Amino acid sequence: ASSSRNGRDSNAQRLGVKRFGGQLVNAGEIIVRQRGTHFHPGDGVGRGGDDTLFALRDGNVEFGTRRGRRVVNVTPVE
Amino acid sequence: MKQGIHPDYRETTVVCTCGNTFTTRSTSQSGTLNADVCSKCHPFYTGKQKILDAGGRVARFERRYG
Amino acid sequence: AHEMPRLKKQYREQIRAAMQEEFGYRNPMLIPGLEKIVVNMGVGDAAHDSKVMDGAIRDITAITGQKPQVTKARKSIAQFKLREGQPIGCHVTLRGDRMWEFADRLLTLALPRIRDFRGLNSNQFDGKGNYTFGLSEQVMFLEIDQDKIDRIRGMDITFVTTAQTNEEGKALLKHLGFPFKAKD
Amino acid sequence: DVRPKITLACTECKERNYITKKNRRNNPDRMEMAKFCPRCRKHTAHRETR
Amino acid sequence: ASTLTVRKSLSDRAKARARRQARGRKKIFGTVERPRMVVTRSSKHVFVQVIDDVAGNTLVSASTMEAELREMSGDKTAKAARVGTIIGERAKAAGITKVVFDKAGNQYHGRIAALADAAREAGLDF
Amino acid sequence: MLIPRRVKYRKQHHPKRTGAAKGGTQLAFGDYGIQATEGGYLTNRQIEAARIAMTRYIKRGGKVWINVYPDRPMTKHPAESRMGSGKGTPEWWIANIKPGRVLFELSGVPEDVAREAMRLAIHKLPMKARFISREG
RNA sequence: GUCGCCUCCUAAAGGGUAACGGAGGCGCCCAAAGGUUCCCUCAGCCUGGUUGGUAAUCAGGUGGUGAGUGUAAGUGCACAAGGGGGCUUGACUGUGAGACUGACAGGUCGAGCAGGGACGAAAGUCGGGACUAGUGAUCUGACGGUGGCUUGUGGAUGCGCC
RNA sequence: UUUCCGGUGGCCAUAGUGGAAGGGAAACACCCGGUCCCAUUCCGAACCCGGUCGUUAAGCCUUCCAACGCUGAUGGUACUGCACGAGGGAUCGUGUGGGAGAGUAAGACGCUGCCGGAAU
Ligand SMILES: [Mg+2]
Ligand SMILES: [Mg+2]
Ligand SMILES: [Mg+2]
Ligand SMILES: [Mg+2]
Ligand SMILES: [Mg+2]
Ligand SMILES: [Mg+2]
Ligand SMILES: [Mg+2]
Ligand SMILES: [Mg+2]
Ligand SMILES: [Mg+2]
Ligand SMILES: [Mg+2]
Ligand SMILES: [Mg+2]
Ligand SMILES: [Mg+2]
Ligand SMILES: [Mg+2]
Ligand SMILES: [Mg+2]
Ligand SMILES: [Mg+2]
Ligand SMILES: [Mg+2]
Ligand SMILES: [Mg+2]
Ligand SMILES: [Zn+2]
Ligand SMILES: [Zn+2]
Structure with a gap:
């Protein structure tokens, strides 16, 4: 007969948004795993080596736009 | 400018061999310039060639028959 | 030395006067x-x-x-x-x-x-007053020696002028003084 | 073989501080680097071991 | 008026300086702790503003257009140095302590450098 | 035979057979049309048979348009073989037809001969179809 | 035929999801293709020009991303993460608040701090590479350092730790 | 206070692209030089410095144009959560909630904050 010349898939990477808008986070909490900057780091958000976006401070996550970039901010909690 | 990068360029006397001399400056070495012809000495735009063309078919007809 | 090149002074006086009188721009610059x-x-x-x-x-x-x-x-x-x-x-x-x-x-x-x-062609204009031509040789430049050239070579000389249209660029180069024929 | 592992040791205390890789054709000779020696407590010159 | 795109039909120097300014602003941002010191350098004058970019409002500013600096005899670099001294004095008056310097698309050289060094002499932590 | 010059993927999932026609529900080329009232898969051989029927009836007058192209490859399992061992190779080329899709257009021919030619062509298609016109 | 890893689709707009389902890649490479600082904008098209032609090189206009990205694909990047110049070794040592992700072994991101450095005028950035593959637990043994232990004591020897 | 204008942000085309006309008081800008700090993988083109002469020609700014591009309802339709129903079958329909894309009418020749200059 014949055989299948496909069959290989990589393991699941479980990317995506981990903390959504208005969610209270600690400093250092990961907000989104991503490849590239689909989201950019905003105010109080840092970007990791693998483009992970993490909270630089305590507060609430918000998603927005800064200039032309789609950003994630962590607004300090009042 | 920089030192030790460019060739020597000093004052120079020239001759155009057509009653023309100038006080330009050129890259030559320990001597003078002797050029064949200049622009004002040239026969192009002073009108001394008048080549046009030679297309007298009827002119040659009349010269060699009449 | 400290002496403006003859071409530059002739350009300024004669050519600026000629272009002002012949094209009549509404602004001096x-x-x-x-x-x-x-x-x-x-x-x-x-x-x-x-x-x-x-x-x-x-x-x-x-x-x-x-x-x-x-x-x-x-x-x-x-x-x-x-x-x-x-x-x-x-x-x-x-x-x-x-x-x-x-x-x-x-x-x-x-x-x-x-x-x-036989002069240079006046149909070699790019469409914005800038005029280019090519030389198949390099030995005309008398400021260099003659008995020490390695090999034959040529060049392209391009004049880039602040002329909006081809007609006034051609006028500029002609009044500066160029061998211009009337053939293709 | 073509990109081997090379050990960088301090030129002061002969301490095999670092290990990295090179090409052995782009860098045929031993590599000099300015690394930090935990023993010498400062930045010293490290050389590939021979 | 700050559109993210560089407006076309701008002159070549204007386009280049706009690109340089936008690239400089990528890492420079004025907060209350460290406001941004922007020096706008034209062919005649230097206009300095210290800005809290969070609120988008200028805290203090100085220029060669002020009354006590039109008559002052000096060079362009000397006038820029006097402007740097004045802006440092005004920053100390308003309680700024430290600023982050923004060359606004120009090279840190000459008039801008003299302004920055004078502001540093005045007591600015940068 | 209508076969594409090339396709990006030769092994594709079956086209969806759900929903009314997404586009091409109105006459755009000819004066009369065949409109599909049922969905299905229209192979290139059926398209060719219908085209031959119309073209042979109408003879020399007018033009015929095929609004649907069979650019969807359908694979075939190796014959007499068990299941598995990969997907088969393409065997048929189909167009995915939905109710209300104008399949063929006809022009430059009066209404009765057009009606007869399109009746002949419709008797070749695997789905139900009807003759349509531009409101006369 | 396949067996581990990476990318996309199937996968039903969080994540996950199978088949001998559909496509491809990896078992590297780079002392710069790493760090930092500064500067620059492409491909394509049109026109003019010696060799030179569609396409080497030059000039003017137009062109916003269709070029490029060490390497598959996807997500990104023109603010460039793409092109170039200068100086460099952070391709660090001791750490790791807090998190993401797996039954677990494990995989991944990480603020702030000290030491000693690189670049910058500074702000600052740097614990390799735009990101995600380029990898192998434990046992056993080996090499360098250190000197904690050593069967009576001192050595030796052996072991331990990194 | 107001008007006009020079910088510096925010929204990131309702803002742009294109066309027509007009303006420069301070400012801006081209512009004039390159001695000096500094520079071009060649070039004072650019970067940098000294001036502010000349000029509003271009940048910039004001106004007009819906032209290209951009924004864009209401209603309907597709689709769909839940509950059902029909057909021999691909498949289809209804109740109850949600509801696009396209298209149409239409909007639109930017909105706005701070600093400064001139006049008021
Ligand atoms: Mg990184
Ligand atoms: Mg990495
Ligand atoms: Mg349509
Ligand atoms: Mg999903
Ligand atoms: Mg789902
Ligand atoms: Mg399962
Ligand atoms: Mg390493
Ligand atoms: Mg922790
Ligand atoms: Mg991984
Ligand atoms: Mg440190
Ligand atoms: Mg890089
Ligand atoms: Mg064992
Ligand atoms: Mg004993
Ligand atoms: Mg250790
Ligand atoms: Mg609409
Ligand atoms: Mg609606
Ligand atoms: Mg709608
Ligand atoms: Zn002569
Ligand atoms: Zn050492």
Whole structure:
């Protein structure tokens, strides 16, 4: 007969948004795993080596736009 | 400018061999310039060639028959 | 020395007066002028040896008076025996008084002593007042020696002028003084 | 074989502080680097071991 | 008026300086702790503003257009140095302590450098 | 035979057979049309048979348009073989037809001969179809 | 035929999801293709020009991303993460608040701090590479350092730790 | 206070692209030089410095144009959560909630904050 010349898939990477808008986070909490900057780091958000976006401070996550970039901010909690 | 990068360029006397001399400056070495012809000495735009063309078919007809 | 080149003074007085009277611009700083001279040399036959490039550098430095921009190959082409990064051309940009004196020396000395010289074409305009022409030889420039040339080479001389249209650029170059014929 | 592992040791205390890789054709000779020696407590010159 | 795109039909120097300014602003941002010191350098004057970019409002500013600096005899670099001294004095008056310097698309050289060094002499922590 | 010059993927999932026609529900080329009232897969051989029927009836007058192209490859399992061992190779080329899709257009021919030619062509298609016109 | 890893689709707009389902890649490479600082904009098209032609090199206009990205694909990047110049070794040592992701072994991101450095005028950035593959637990043994232990004591020897 | 204008942000085309006309008081800008700090993988073109002469020609700014591009309802339709129903079958329909894309009418020749200059 014949055989299948496909069959290989990589393991699941479980990317995506981990903390959504208005969610209270600690400093250092990961907000989104991503490849590239689909989201950019905003105010109080840092970007990791693998483009992970993490909270630089305590507060609430918000998603927005800064200039032309789609950003994630962590607004300090009042 | 920089030192030790460019060739020597000093004052120079020239001759155009057509009653023309100038006080330009050129890259030559320990001597003078002797050029064949200049622009004002040239026969192009002073009108001394008048080549046009030679297309007298009827002119040659009349010269060699009449 | 401290003396404005004769071409520059003649340009200013005669040519500015002529363009003001003949084209009649409504603003004083609209009269076109010579922006720069560009001497290019495609040295494409230098992928196999580098001494011909020493010759090219010497020839065009003596012609222009400044060291050239040696340009490396942009992209590799196999139809061309051409790789990437090998320098395959050299050009000199003359601006300021140097452009004027190079233009004067070219006009008075270089192009008139071409074999069976017949002027230069006036149909070589790019469409914005800038006029380019090519020389198949480099031996007309009498400021260089004769019995020590390595190999035959040519160049492209480009006049970039601040002339909006082709007609006033042609007028500018003609009034500066160019051998212009009436043939194609 | 073509990109081997090379050990960088301090030129002061001969301490095999670092290990990295090179090409052995692009860098045929031993590599000098300015690394930090935990023993010498400062930045010293490190050389590939021979 | 700050559109993210560089407006076309701008002159070549204007386009280049706009690109340089936008690239400089990528890492420079003025907060209350460290406001941004922007020096706008034209062919005649230097206009300095210290800005809290969070609120988008200028805290203090100085220029060669002020009354006590039109008559002052000096060079362009000397006038820029006097402007740097004045802006440092005004920053100390308003309680700024430290600023982050923004060359606004120009090279840190000459008039801008003299302004920055004078502001540093005045007591600015940068 | 209508076969594409090339396709990006030769092994594709079956086209969806759900929903009314997404586009091409109105005459755009000819004066009369065949409109599909049922969905299905229209192979290139059926398209060719219908085209031959119309073209042979109408003879020399007018033009015929095929609004649907069979650019969907359908694979075939190796014959007499068990299941598995990969997907088969393409065997048929189909167009995915939905109710209300104008399949063929006809022009330059009066209404009765057009009606007869399109009746002949419709008797070749695997789905139900009807003759349509531009409101006369 | 396949067996581990990476990318996309199937996968039903969080994540996950199978088949001998559909496509491809990896078992590296780079002392710069790493760090930092500064500068630059492309491909394509049109026109003019010696060799030179569609396409080497030059000039003017137009062109916003269709070029490029070490390497598959996807997500990104023109603010460039793409092109170039200068100086460099952070391709660090001791750490790791807090998190993401797996039954677990494990995989991944990480603020702030000290030491000693690189670049910058500074702000600052740097614990390799735009990101995600380029990898192998434990046992056993080996080499360098250190000197904690050593069967009566001192050595030796052996072991331990990194 | 107001008007006009020079910088510096925010929204990131309702803002742009294109066309027509007009303006420069301070400012801006081209512009004039290159001696000096500094520079071009050649060039004072650019970067940098000294001036502010000349000029509003271009940048910039004001106004007009819906032209290209951009924004864009209401209603309907597709689709769909839940509950059902029909057909021999691909598949289809209804109740109850949600509800596009396209298209149409239409909007639109930017909105706005701070600093400064001139006049008021
Ligand atoms: Mg990184
Ligand atoms: Mg990494
Ligand atoms: Mg349609
Ligand atoms: Mg999903
Ligand atoms: Mg789902
Ligand atoms: Mg399962
Ligand atoms: Mg390493
Ligand atoms: Mg922790
Ligand atoms: Mg992984
Ligand atoms: Mg430190
Ligand atoms: Mg890089
Ligand atoms: Mg065992
Ligand atoms: Mg014992
Ligand atoms: Mg350790
Ligand atoms: Mg709409
Ligand atoms: Mg609606
Ligand atoms: Mg709608
Ligand atoms: Zn002569
Ligand atoms: Zn050491």
